[model samples]
Target: GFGCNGPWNEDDLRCHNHCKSIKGYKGGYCAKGGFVCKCY
Candidate 1:
């Protein structure tokens, strides 16, 4: 569950659009655009 899932938009910079802070999960940036989440 570690990846981005959304349209590619350079205008988006919010954490919600760049990553998802889920419980016991590690989120990060997306090169193609969108949020990335991971369960750790």
Candidate 2:
């Protein structure tokens, strides 16, 4: 778990599994108990 929460937009909550960086990564969502960045 990323230990983060969201007021994520409906379109931004799609499940994903890859990110460029955690610190610089923007909006994200959780999938199967993991975090994934929506953009870098």
How many backbone clashes does every candidate have?
0, 0
Top-TM-score candidate index: 2
Please give the TM-score that candidate 2 achieves against the real structure.
0.21
- TM-score per candidate, chains pooled: 0.20, 0.21
Question: Cα miss at 7, model 1 (Å)?
Answer: 11
**Tens digits of lDDT, candidate 2, 1-40:** 3433433432233423233344566555554333433454
Clashing pairs in model 2, backbone N/Cα/C closer than 3 A: none
Candidate 1 lDDT over residue span 1-40, tens digit each: 1434454432223434334455543444443434433223
Candidate 1 residue 33 C-alpha distance from true site, Å:
5.9
Query: How high is the CA lDDT of each candidate model?
Result: 0.38, 0.40
- What TM-score would candidate 1 get against the native? 0.20
